[PDB]
Amino acid sequence: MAEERQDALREFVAVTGAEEDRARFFLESAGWDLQIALASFYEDGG
Secondary structure, X not given: OOOHHHHHHHHHXXXXXXXXXXXXXXXXXOOOXXXXXXXXXXXXXX
């Protein structure tokens, strides 16, 4: 359960390729969601 944050964001780290922690940073900031968190990585700076 609570461990989902680590694995869940990693799924993202797989999508955004971020770092367990980098994603967790904006992974959670956006609700550890992949749709939004992703738009950030891409819209993070051209």
